[PDB]
Amino acid sequence: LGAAGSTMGAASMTLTVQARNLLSGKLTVWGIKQLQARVLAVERYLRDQQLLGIWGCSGKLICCTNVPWNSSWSNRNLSEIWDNMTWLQWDKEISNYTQIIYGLLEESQNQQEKNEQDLL
Amino acid sequence: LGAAGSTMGAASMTLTVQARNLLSGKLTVWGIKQLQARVLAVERYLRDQQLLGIWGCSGKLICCTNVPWNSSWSNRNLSEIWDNMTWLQWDKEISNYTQIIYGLLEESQNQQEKNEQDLL
Amino acid sequence: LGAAGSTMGAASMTLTVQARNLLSGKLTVWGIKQLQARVLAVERYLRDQQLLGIWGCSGKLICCTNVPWNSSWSNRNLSEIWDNMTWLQWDKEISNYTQIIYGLLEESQNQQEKNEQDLL
Amino acid sequence: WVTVYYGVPVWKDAETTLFCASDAKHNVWATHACVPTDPNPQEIHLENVTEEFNMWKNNMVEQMHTDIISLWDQSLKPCVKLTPLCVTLQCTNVTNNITDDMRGELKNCSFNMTTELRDKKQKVYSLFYRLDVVQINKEYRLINCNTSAITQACPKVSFEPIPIHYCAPAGFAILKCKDKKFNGTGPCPSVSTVQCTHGIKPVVSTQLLLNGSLAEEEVMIRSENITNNAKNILVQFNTPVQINCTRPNNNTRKSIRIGPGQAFYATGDIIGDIRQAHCNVSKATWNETLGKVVKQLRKHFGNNTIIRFANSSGGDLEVTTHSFNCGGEFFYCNTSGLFNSTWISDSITLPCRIKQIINMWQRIGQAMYAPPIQGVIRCVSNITGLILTRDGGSTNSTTETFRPGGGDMRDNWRSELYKYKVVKIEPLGVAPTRC
Amino acid sequence: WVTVYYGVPVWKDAETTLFCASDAKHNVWATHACVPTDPNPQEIHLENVTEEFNMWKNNMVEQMHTDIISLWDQSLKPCVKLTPLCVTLQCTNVTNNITDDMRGELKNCSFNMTTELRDKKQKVYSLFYRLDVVQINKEYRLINCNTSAITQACPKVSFEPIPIHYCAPAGFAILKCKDKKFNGTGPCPSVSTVQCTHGIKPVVSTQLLLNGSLAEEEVMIRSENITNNAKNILVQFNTPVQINCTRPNNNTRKSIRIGPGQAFYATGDIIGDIRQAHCNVSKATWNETLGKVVKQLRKHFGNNTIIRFANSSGGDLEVTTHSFNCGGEFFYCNTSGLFNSTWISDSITLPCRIKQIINMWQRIGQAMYAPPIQGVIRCVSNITGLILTRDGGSTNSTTETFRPGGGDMRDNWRSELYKYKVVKIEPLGVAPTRC
Amino acid sequence: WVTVYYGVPVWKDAETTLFCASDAKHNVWATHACVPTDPNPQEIHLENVTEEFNMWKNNMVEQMHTDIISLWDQSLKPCVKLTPLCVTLQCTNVTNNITDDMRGELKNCSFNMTTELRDKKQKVYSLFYRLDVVQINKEYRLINCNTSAITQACPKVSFEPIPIHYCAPAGFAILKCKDKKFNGTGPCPSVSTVQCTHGIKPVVSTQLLLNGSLAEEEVMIRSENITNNAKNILVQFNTPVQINCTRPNNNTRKSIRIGPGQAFYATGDIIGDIRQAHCNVSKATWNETLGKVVKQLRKHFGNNTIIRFANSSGGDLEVTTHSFNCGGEFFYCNTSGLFNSTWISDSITLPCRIKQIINMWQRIGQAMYAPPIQGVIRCVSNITGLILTRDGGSTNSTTETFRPGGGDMRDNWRSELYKYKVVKIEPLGVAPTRC
Ligand SMILES: *[C@@H]1O[C@H](CO)[C@@H](O[C@@H]2O[C@H](CO)[C@@H](O[C@@H]3O[C@H](CO[C@H]4O[C@H](CO)[C@@H](O)[C@H](O)[C@@H]4O)[C@@H](O)[C@H](O[C@H]4O[C@H](CO)[C@@H](O)[C@H](O)[C@@H]4O[C@H]4O[C@H](CO)[C@@H](O)[C@H](O)[C@@H]4O[C@H]4O[C@H](CO)[C@@H](O)[C@H](O)[C@@H]4O)[C@@H]3O)[C@H](O)[C@H]2NC(C)=O)[C@H](O)[C@H]1NC(C)=O
Ligand SMILES: *[C@@H]1O[C@H](CO)[C@@H](O[C@@H]2O[C@H](CO)[C@@H](O[C@@H]3O[C@H](CO[C@H]4O[C@H](CO)[C@@H](O)[C@H](O)[C@@H]4O)[C@@H](O)[C@H](O[C@H]4O[C@H](CO)[C@@H](O)[C@H](O)[C@@H]4O[C@H]4O[C@H](CO)[C@@H](O)[C@H](O)[C@@H]4O)[C@@H]3O)[C@H](O)[C@H]2NC(C)=O)[C@H](O)[C@H]1NC(C)=O
Ligand SMILES: *[C@@H]1O[C@H](CO)[C@@H](O[C@@H]2O[C@H](CO)[C@@H](O[C@@H]3O[C@H](CO[C@H]4O[C@H](CO)[C@@H](O)[C@H](O)[C@@H]4O)[C@@H](O)[C@H](O[C@H]4O[C@H](CO)[C@@H](O)[C@H](O)[C@@H]4O[C@H]4O[C@H](CO)[C@@H](O)[C@H](O)[C@@H]4O)[C@@H]3O)[C@H](O)[C@H]2NC(C)=O)[C@H](O)[C@H]1NC(C)=O
Ligand SMILES: *[C@@H]1O[C@H](CO)[C@@H](O[C@@H]2O[C@H](CO)[C@@H](O[C@@H]3O[C@H](CO[C@H]4O[C@H](CO)[C@@H](O)[C@H](O)[C@@H]4O)[C@@H](O)[C@H](O[C@H]4O[C@H](CO)[C@@H](O)[C@H](O)[C@@H]4O[C@H]4O[C@H](CO)[C@@H](O)[C@H](O)[C@@H]4O)[C@@H]3O)[C@H](O)[C@H]2NC(C)=O)[C@H](O)[C@H]1NC(C)=O
Ligand SMILES: *[C@@H]1O[C@H](CO)[C@@H](O)[C@H](O)[C@H]1NC(C)=O
Ligand SMILES: *[C@@H]1O[C@H](CO)[C@@H](O)[C@H](O)[C@H]1NC(C)=O
Ligand SMILES: *[C@@H]1O[C@H](CO)[C@@H](O)[C@H](O)[C@H]1NC(C)=O
Ligand SMILES: *[C@@H]1O[C@H](CO)[C@@H](O)[C@H](O)[C@H]1NC(C)=O
Ligand SMILES: *[C@@H]1O[C@H](CO)[C@@H](O)[C@H](O)[C@H]1NC(C)=O
Ligand SMILES: *[C@@H]1O[C@H](CO)[C@@H](O)[C@H](O)[C@H]1NC(C)=O
């Protein structure tokens, strides 16, 4: 985490670095913890990879979908949002729509890209 | 599992939902089970993801390859197979060719897409 | 491992076979080992999959990037290197540049493919 | 041409490890360690889907049994050993106020016990139930002393059954049979998918099934083979029968230090007078219910048959009596007052015995000592079913007799898990197309 | 339009399992099992980032406590039981060369002990400290014999604290507060990210905090609620105070076989004369330091107040004395010589007691017996802080009195972990754009 | 340009955890827990591949040793303790029918043993072998009673070696050396890859290696340093030698209850007469085989040398005798009848001793008591190799003497695992191209 307090725009050209350490890769006291620590890192990693799989990106870090931005979703200028404020600040307001956005990210893209390219 | 007894054709526009819950994401009685339960879910998930990796799809749910359909593989009309019968029913007959089909899915695509695009 | 002592050129048309068995997929003596054996296979598998994710390939086995080959990196003819010598032999000399190459594989591709396609 | 699909609804019979979930104190089933349940465990009905079940080949039963026994032993492990009680005992009868039947049932007995300082003994006494001692030729020894170590259950651990839900790991699912006449085997059209079963309380009993689920409409008769006298018949009622059990003696307990932080809970003196610790079964409800059981049994034997009931013919207390547990106390009630009469075409009281040294799960080794409870015990349970066996002999004419057989706790589980099977999901398959 | 980004610097408060790391013999904290530390644990300063901390709600403390107690019990598990020592003891005074104060402190005491062949006893004797025995009406028993089993620590296991680093699992991180005046709670502008904390030695003590970290500039006063007399005040010094402790008696030990590979280490005869086993605190440094403590306490009470010190008012030795451990020996020192005088506007010596039967972590059950050490013990420690409590009563005018209270080892941890919090990284989020 | 390939055949020396596999009762090696083996464990020959091996630095040996010792202790954990047998014993000689040599070998001995009721003792007797008792000044104690607790092996657990296969976790592989003259170290051109080793029976012995694999063509001589007298020389035969061992005494056993489910198996009376329990080695085969061993030893010393054999010079029974196990019985045979004569240019019988209290793995603590076997024991084994040491002194001229040294079970493993090494696969690499 080096992007820190830089703005979301600025914070984009460093996603690689943070991504790199997300996975990293008897019994008795400590041995138990080390085992579950390894299991947890794996479970969390995959928990998110499948989501980018479903929100058809896969070749991640940065990707775009076919969902329009809603005006209720903190409709503020791009000149502020993707230039003069940080992720953390953004997450604090946008997170209210997390499930809504995620449902749209999954289905709007899969309903229109899949099926259509199977016909074609 | 909501596609249930719908036909394979119908069952296509819901693959997202089933896929979503495939991964989901001390010691003593129960604690042991919970640990292996988590390990197993991960192992099964990856066991299949690598296969779609090899049968060059990755950006899964639905994908196509360069393998022709064999006439021995339940050659029945598409108007029945992908319209008026269920997966379960299909699996009961097509599964006899599982290894044959899988070997073809891996190599016919990798032999012709890879190498050819390395030359190009 | 069947490519064995075949040359790197020859060893290419078999990457599928080796890749297939990389993942494969109480307590007391033996039970402990079996559990960590499963955990380890998973951790190693993912440890590498994320790297091919970052070195934007994903649809792996064979892929190309936008990094030029350096003359310090065993500059020997392709007619030897990718025709008349084995991986093992190659790794013994090229490995001296592992971190250098890897850093370039990650960033040269992500800096130029991402951002550029976000503008476009 | 050949195309592949991933999230396809295809499953196969499978066996995996299922885990506990609970609604989230410190009882014997440690159901704190189970992780809280799903507030919205919505089933997915599978439209136009058939399925096949067999309760008599269902491995979910084996896991429930395995988990309970293992858990039982775990919970009793870090507790006081009673090895020092295996000494010659000097016993007499408790005769202060015998209420006729409890004549030889309670014994007043003394012994030389180990103290904190292992060079001096103390003379102590406690009360024992007749079933817990053996006379050695008025000298006695504890029953099972010659067979196994006796361990005192930790006094703070509750034995009240708490519903346990079994849940599948991701990639697996549990299918639930919704055919409300399902006899335990064969096809069950109309099935739903759940990630977790409903909660099942780990209630243990013999002869009469307590606090279980009820049949939806009719009393159900289920057996692996109804004509095989070696198999049990499980009967699931479609209505509860109330049973009220008590142990009226007002008890006291003594704490006797044996060693350095090691103490035994002795049954102390009894306050007031003595009672049989009987159970009440509503009379009309019980026999009316049996009339329903008979109506259904006839379907497999003939509508002109005679159904007779009789009591258990013999064997260990766990198979001759109604074994159950209330508050941690162990009861063995006489059910000969229930399994009687014949069908051709007010309150029942059951005397009971109390026993403190219990060999659970019908094992030879390992005995548990139930510490005394001082408060007067009262418990009300729902009889939800029966374990019956068909008798043998010539089984001639049209007359058959059923008895309250029992033993093997796996059947009690089986009676709740019969609606479920474990399957694995194989989210990958191919089909022909033109693309 | 809606686009998604992965490696975004977003984190939330979180609780996970942290694990041990060490710099990589066989001490009580088994820090061989911890995996070697990172030779280059470079922190990442987070530019333009604020954060909020609360040392009094920090779950890292609970894990450190849990791990230490569990680990302690693990290490002492495979050791010799001293149950056979709970016998009547015949004790007299050690009077060969009493140096005035050690008058009734050492007792010479004999007993009939179990031998390898369990049909013959041996007559043996050993020395005991007064605090380890109870007179029973000159017959004695070991203290806590009537309460718990006593286990001898394995003689080869070191009790020297080794720094332990806590590390986060991937997907998690630990944030470090760099505001060098942070009072333990609220916002801490200027935070850095680490995967691991610095090493913290698991030093256990009461009243005086030893061998911890120092405050960067000023003496820091920290409390959950400084006006709540039920809460402790932790004081972190910005300079060490030297404390020198000794146990001058030249000891010997005897090995008494009790059984088949089971042996007890008895305090043997003392060579030479007897001493109080006192501790020296540099006089000027100590009281100068208190002057600094007072200057800072005044900020919360008024600059016209009177700060007075007094000793602990009463309770168990762990809360009335300076409990600490040197070389495996357990000291209980009298700190009334330190907590004295009043602020308005050479060497101190503390007598101490030695005790071998220790109930650690203030539990009722489980006692550990510290085997004797023959070499003369000397240890030098850094006093790095205090545990103080504000007294009660009418607390009138401008005068307040503080005492060296203590107990509950979680506060010692808390004093080192206050700069850290655990967060989880959620590397996924969306933002608007036009693409 | 720079391109990357994944499934590349590149591996490095590596150390990981290997796991058990078996062909899938309840023996001491719990090989039910191992998961069934691969019906078709096809090796992959690596064409044009060289590799380097070192059997004397092979960590597979350390895991096999670690697993066996841990497993041994696990299997013997839940068993009857014999602590109560450490009492004064009153022993005499068994003189009913001594067959000359077995003069002082069997003792008839009585003692006062604990009973189910711990207030009364029983007078019992049993037979002991001379090697299991110590005379205390005809009073005796059990050997090792003064050193360690003695535990009775559970009577139902088999000690018959079952082949164990070691398997690599995915991402790892085991390479097998196919050079059929490999001397244990250095390059081994011609290597194949397997996921699992062949099965190795965990046979334990000293001096003579039993039931192992055979050399493909020649007798092989292997050592870390053949000129270092501190190192052992392992000899692998290219042909088996038959050895037939017996324990002819027809035994009985008594079961003596000690406590509440705790019982000891005592050697009971012997039916018929007494025998030495000797072993037969085919005479010609044995010495012919040594002639082959000599022919090969000469290659390292000179073709004009003298090779002499002598017996073990001294030490514990495990290094002076042929230690082995048949049916759970422990034999110590005298091999001085084998290691004899000199090479310049019918049946052998070995007397043996029987011992019941065994300290396995040459540890000081923990003794196991082998319960008696009633049936007459007969076993036939394959001698497959030798453990030899080169003697010292001036080692002058051309004459050298070898002795049947031994101890340290790791060498027996090493003798089977020498053909294998563990490597890790690193399926990722780059190479130049133009694309
Ligand atoms: C195991 O232990 C458990 C725990 O104790 C046992 O369960 C208990 O069983 C009891 C008996 O069945 C039961 O008691 C009944 O509760 C009913 C519920 O009433 C509730 O509402 C009223 C409203 O004010 C409250 O006051 C009351 O507290 C409750 O909240 C009552 O309605 C029942 O009363 C009837 O029976 C009693 C018996 O003595 C009569 O005295 C009473 O008058 C009622 O009977 C009249 O009505 C019936 C209706 O058909 C007529 O048939 C009957 O002849 C009576 O009618 C005549 O008389 C009345 C009055 O003179 C007159 O007006 C009318 O015109 C007629 O002349 C009764 O109180 C407990 O609640 C129950 N406890 C629990 C927790 O469930 C269990 O059974 C035990 N099991 C076994 C095997 O023993
Ligand atoms: C079939 O299903 C039924 C219905 O669920 C089930 O009946 C229930 O059985 C349990 C276990 O026997 C009963 O629980 C006990 O009830 C008594 C009665 O308390 C009443 O009054 C209090 C007043 O506040 C109410 O809160 C309560 O709801 C009742 O109205 C309690 O006293 C028991 O608690 C004590 O014992 C526990 C045992 O582990 C302790 O954990 C607990 O802390 C209490 O112990 C303390 O007090 C003791 C008094 O002597 C003392 O000795 C201890 O040392 C300690 O101080 C307990 O709650 C429950 O009430 C029954 N339900 C009903 C409706 O009656 C059947 O058992 C079940 N059948 C089968 C076969 O499983
Ligand atoms: C706050 O921080 C300080 C500074 O770190 C810390 O002080 C240190 O405490 C430890 C533990 O008490 C001290 O360690 C002991 O030191 C003695 C003295 O040895 C000196 O001379 C040798 C000569 O080569 C030097 O190497 C050494 O550095 C010293 O100069 C040692 O003798 C102790 O070792 C024995 O006891 C250990 C206990 O487990 C054994 O493991 C070890 O093998 C040794 O035992 C052997 O000898 C014994 C002699 O009688 C014998 O009885 C045993 O059976 C066995 O044979 C040990 O190293 C350390 O020196 C202190 N540091 C300083 C600078 O003095 C404070 O304790 C800490 N405060 C708190 C409260 O934690
Ligand atoms: C090198 O490799 C060789 C070859 O594999 C190996 O030899 C074998 O050693 C084992 C172990 O000593 C031998 O196994 C025993 O054989 C006896 C003889 O039984 C014969 O007759 C029966 C009749 O049906 C045949 O089935 C059988 O194959 C033989 O022909 C058996 O009696 C033994 O079984 C008893 O002891 C077991 C010990 O755990 C029990 O588990 C088992 O249940 C049996 O016990 C019961 O009977 C006992 C009789 O007194 C009674 O006391 C018990 O309480 C219980 O009731 C066992 O099978 C095997 O036969 C040998 N193989 C050959 C070809 O002879 C070498 O040992 C090996 N060398 C080394 C050093 O490892
Ligand atoms: C962007 O800034 C302009 C400046 O006047 C303002 O009018 C407009 O509404 C802003 N857009 C949003 C979404 O805030
Ligand atoms: C499809 O249906 C037509 C109808 O006549 C039939 O002739 C044809 O063979 C069918 N194809 C297959 C593959 O069954
Ligand atoms: C390739 O071979 C030619 C042959 O003369 C040589 O001149 C050239 O330098 C070689 N290239 C490399 C990179 O070795
Ligand atoms: C206690 O021991 C004495 C010893 O003589 C015996 O007389 C007495 O009966 C014993 N007491 C009991 C209750 O067994
Ligand atoms: C040992 O036992 C004897 C038995 O009479 C007793 O007199 C003696 O005092 C005991 N010794 C000790 C030290 O307790
Ligand atoms: C048993 O104890 C009595 C007590 O006097 C002793 O005489 C006898 O010899 C003991 N028996 C044995 C076999 O040790």
Author numbering:
A (entry chain I), B (entry chain G), C (entry chain B): 523 to 547, 567 to 661
D (entry chain E), E (entry chain F), F (entry chain A): 35 to 58, 65 to 141, 150 to 185, 189 to 309, 312 to 321, 321A, 322 to 397, 412 to 501
Mind quoting what the paper says about this structure?
The envelope spike (Env) of the human immunodeficiency virus type 1 (HIV-1) mediates infection of target host cells and is consequently a main target for vaccine design. In addition, a dense coat of host-derived, immunologically “self” N-linked glycans shield the underlying protein from host antibody responses (Wei et al., 2003).
The secondary binding sites make contact with the D2- and D3-arms of the oligomannose-type glycans at positions N332 and N339. As expected, the N295A and N392A deletions resulted in a substantial decrease in antibody binding. Previous site-specific glycan analyses of BG505 SOSIP.664 trimers have reported the N295, N332, N339, N386, N392, and N448 sites to be occupied by oligomannose-type glycans, predominantly Man9 (Behrens et al., 2016, Cao et al., 2017). The BG505 transmitted/founder virus naturally lacks the conserved N332 glycan site, thus this glycan was also included (T332N) in the BG505 SOSIP.664 trimers to introduce the “supersite” epitope (Sanders et al., 2013).
